[PDB]
Amino acid sequence: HMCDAFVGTWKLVSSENFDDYMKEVGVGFATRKVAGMAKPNMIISVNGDVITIKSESTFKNTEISFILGQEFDEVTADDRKVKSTITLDGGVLVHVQKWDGKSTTIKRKREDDKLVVECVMKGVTSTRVYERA
Numbered sequence: 001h002m003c004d005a006f007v008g009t010w011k012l013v014s015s016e017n018f019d020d021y022m023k024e025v026g027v028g029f030a031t032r033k034v035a036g037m038a039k040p041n042m043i044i045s046v047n048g049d050v051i052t053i054k055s056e057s058t059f060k061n062t063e064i065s066f067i068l069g070q071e072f073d074e075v076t077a078d079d080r081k082v083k084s085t086i087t088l089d090g091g092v093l094v095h096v097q098k099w100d101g102k103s104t105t106i107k108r109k110r111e112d113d114k115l116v117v118e119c120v121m122k123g124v125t126s127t128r129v130y131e132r133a
Ligand SMILES: O=C([O-])c1cc(C2CCCCC2)ccc1O
Pocket: 022, 025, 027, 035, 040, 076, 077, 078, 106, 117, 119, 128
């Protein structure tokens, strides 16, 4: 019952500063333009202790599965090879990615009927709001 309020299928409804976030992370121009245009569906599910997050769009379809607090190796949609740990902190899913001595944090929060995603790198924040599909 750890992530009950996050489970379901979610669709992007608004975005702010996403280009700038992608630039901070090091994403190249063509990828930023195509990924920025994406309208992803985020599908979150839980089976026992294993959480699965899928992100589907015309840009890329990705899937991660994990156990809270347990590190994994992930290839991101922009093809970074990162070491990721996802934890629950005060009801917020906190996803930290480390690679090449850099770090970024992606927080997912339930706020009213929305799932709000905040992506942060070096003072550059992007806010992505999803609603139930
Ligand atoms: O679409 C999203 O909402 C979303 C996308 C990403 C990555 C996409 C590829 C480039 C780096 C960011 C990270 C978190 C997100 O929440």
